[PDB]
Design an enzyme around this catalytic site. Sequence first.
Site, PDB file in Angstrom:
ATOM      1  N   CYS A   1       7.696  79.398  33.393  1.00 48.22           N
ATOM      2  CA  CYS A   1       8.239  79.304  32.075  1.00 48.22           C
ATOM      3  C   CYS A   1       7.264  78.587  31.228  1.00 48.22           C
ATOM      4  O   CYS A   1       6.952  77.425  31.476  1.00 48.22           O
ATOM      5  CB  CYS A   1       9.544  78.521  32.045  1.00 48.22           C
ATOM      6  SG  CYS A   1      10.603  79.110  33.373  1.00 48.22           S
TER       7      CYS A   1
ATOM      8  N   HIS B   1      10.670  71.535  40.220  1.00 49.47           N
ATOM      9  CA  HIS B   1      10.155  72.832  40.524  1.00 49.47           C
ATOM     10  C   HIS B   1      11.160  73.618  41.293  1.00 49.47           C
ATOM     11  O   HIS B   1      11.470  74.732  40.889  1.00 49.47           O
ATOM     12  CB  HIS B   1       8.815  72.787  41.277  1.00 49.47           C
ATOM     13  CG  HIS B   1       7.742  72.194  40.405  1.00 49.47           C
ATOM     14  ND1 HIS B   1       6.913  72.985  39.663  1.00 49.47           N
ATOM     15  CD2 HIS B   1       7.480  70.913  40.054  1.00 49.47           C
ATOM     16  CE1 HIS B   1       6.170  72.211  38.888  1.00 49.47           C
ATOM     17  NE2 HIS B   1       6.493  70.945  39.108  1.00 49.47           N
TER      18      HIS B   1
ATOM     19  N   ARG C   1      15.985  86.067  35.948  1.00 54.02           N
ATOM     20  CA  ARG C   1      14.585  85.789  35.770  1.00 54.02           C
ATOM     21  C   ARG C   1      14.313  86.097  34.329  1.00 54.02           C
ATOM     22  O   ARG C   1      13.709  87.120  34.007  1.00 54.02           O
ATOM     23  CB  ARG C   1      13.675  86.670  36.662  1.00 54.02           C
ATOM     24  CG  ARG C   1      13.437  86.166  38.103  1.00 54.02           C
ATOM     25  CD  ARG C   1      14.702  85.873  38.915  1.00 54.02           C
ATOM     26  NE  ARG C   1      14.349  85.678  40.347  1.00 54.02           N
ATOM     27  CZ  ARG C   1      15.336  85.394  41.247  1.00 54.02           C
ATOM     28  NH1 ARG C   1      16.635  85.312  40.837  1.00 54.02           N
ATOM     29  NH2 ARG C   1      15.027  85.182  42.559  1.00 54.02           N
ATOM     30  N   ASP C   2      14.784  85.216  33.417  1.00 52.11           N
ATOM     31  CA  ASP C   2      14.694  85.493  32.012  1.00 52.11           C
ATOM     32  C   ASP C   2      14.743  84.212  31.248  1.00 52.11           C
ATOM     33  O   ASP C   2      14.955  83.141  31.812  1.00 52.11           O
ATOM     34  CB  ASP C   2      15.789  86.444  31.478  1.00 52.11           C
ATOM     35  CG  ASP C   2      17.181  85.816  31.541  1.00 52.11           C
ATOM     36  OD1 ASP C   2      17.658  85.489  32.658  1.00 52.11           O
ATOM     37  OD2 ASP C   2      17.799  85.679  30.451  1.00 52.11           O
TER      38      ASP C   2
ATOM     39  N   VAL D   1       1.935  79.802  45.933  1.00 50.62           N
ATOM     40  CA  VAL D   1       1.842  78.532  45.272  1.00 50.62           C
ATOM     41  C   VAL D   1       0.696  77.800  45.898  1.00 50.62           C
ATOM     42  O   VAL D   1       0.413  78.002  47.076  1.00 50.62           O
ATOM     43  CB  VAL D   1       3.112  77.704  45.425  1.00 50.62           C
ATOM     44  CG1 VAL D   1       4.256  78.388  44.650  1.00 50.62           C
ATOM     45  CG2 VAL D   1       3.504  77.523  46.908  1.00 50.62           C
TER      46      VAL D   1
ATOM     47  N   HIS E   1       3.102  67.749  45.192  1.00 54.01           N
ATOM     48  CA  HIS E   1       2.642  68.124  43.889  1.00 54.01           C
ATOM     49  C   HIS E   1       2.426  69.600  43.978  1.00 54.01           C
ATOM     50  O   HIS E   1       2.669  70.195  45.025  1.00 54.01           O
ATOM     51  CB  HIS E   1       1.342  67.355  43.552  1.00 54.01           C
ATOM     52  CG  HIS E   1       0.524  67.831  42.384  1.00 54.01           C
ATOM     53  ND1 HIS E   1       0.817  67.510  41.088  1.00 54.01           N
ATOM     54  CD2 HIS E   1      -0.588  68.605  42.364  1.00 54.01           C
ATOM     55  CE1 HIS E   1      -0.096  68.069  40.303  1.00 54.01           C
ATOM     56  NE2 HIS E   1      -0.961  68.739  41.054  1.00 54.01           N
TER      57      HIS E   1
ATOM     58  N   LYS F   1       7.716  70.442  28.091  1.00 54.27           N
ATOM     59  CA  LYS F   1       6.630  70.643  29.000  1.00 54.27           C
ATOM     60  C   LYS F   1       6.050  71.966  28.621  1.00 54.27           C
ATOM     61  O   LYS F   1       6.786  72.900  28.312  1.00 54.27           O
ATOM     62  CB  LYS F   1       7.116  70.664  30.468  1.00 54.27           C
ATOM     63  CG  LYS F   1       6.028  70.845  31.540  1.00 54.27           C
ATOM     64  CD  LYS F   1       4.939  69.763  31.542  1.00 54.27           C
ATOM     65  CE  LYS F   1       3.896  69.993  32.640  1.00 54.27           C
ATOM     66  NZ  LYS F   1       2.857  68.943  32.588  1.00 54.27           N
TER      67      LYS F   1
END
Length: 123
Positions: free
Chosen positions: A81, A13, A21-22, A103, A114, A40
Site C-alpha cells: 500500500c 506488516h 486486495r484493494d 519478502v 524487520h 507512512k
Amino acid sequence: QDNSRYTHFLTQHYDAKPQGRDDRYCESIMRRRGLTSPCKDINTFIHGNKRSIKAICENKNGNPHRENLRISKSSFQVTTCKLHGGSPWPPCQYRATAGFRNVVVACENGLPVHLDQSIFRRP
C-alpha cells in the site's frame, strides 16, 4: 522488544489475510493499525502463514542474502500500500498495489525483526 520486536514488525506488516486486495482494505487497515499518523509512505501488509514468516529465518525456507537479510522461498501475498494522499498528516489515501512475491525480511536472533521496503519501494 525481546521477541515482541518481531511481532511489532508483524503488528505493522503481518495481516494474515485481508478483507480484499484493494484500496478500501488498505485505508481501513492503515487506519486501525495506525500508521496513519503521520501517513507512512509505503508499507506492505504481508499475508500468508505465520509459520512461513518465522521459517524465512530458517535456511530451509529462506536463503541467506548477504548481511543477515533473509530472502524468502515461500512467496507471500503482499499488498503493498503506497500513499497517494498528498497530505503527510491524516487522512491518508492508500492505493493498494497488490502483488504476490517474496519478502526480504531482515532477521536478527532467528526472528525476522524487520523487512526491507527496498523491494517494495516501487511495487
